[PDB]
Symmetry: C2
Subunit: 56 residues, 2 copies
């Protein structure tokens, strides 16, 4: 549980902070996971791209 | 208590990505890793909203 769920939730939280802190090229890990971590990662990547477009 | 809130937070991120910055972010006061993710989503939301 700590390695399969806790670790990637912490990593993806950090990714969100990087994005919020203006780094709109932040790496977003785990987009190819088939479980709920993948749903979250794919959601974050769509966010990242949406914010890059909105930066103009 | 892990799967459900992770999907719920993902949906909140999708609302934010689509321009709905009034999305209510659940689970901000949880003490585990879901609380960590919820706080980070709420900070991003607030920064987007204030900027716009
Ligand atoms: Zn990882
Ligand atoms: Zn919930």
């Amino acid at each position: 549980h700590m390695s399969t769920i806790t670790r990637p939730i912490i990593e993806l939280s950090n990714t969100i902070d990087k994005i919020a802190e203006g780094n709109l090229e932040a790496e977003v890990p785990h987009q190819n996971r088939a479980d709920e971590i993948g749903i979250l990662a794919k959601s974050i990547e769509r966010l990242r791209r949406s914010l890059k477009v909105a930066m103009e």
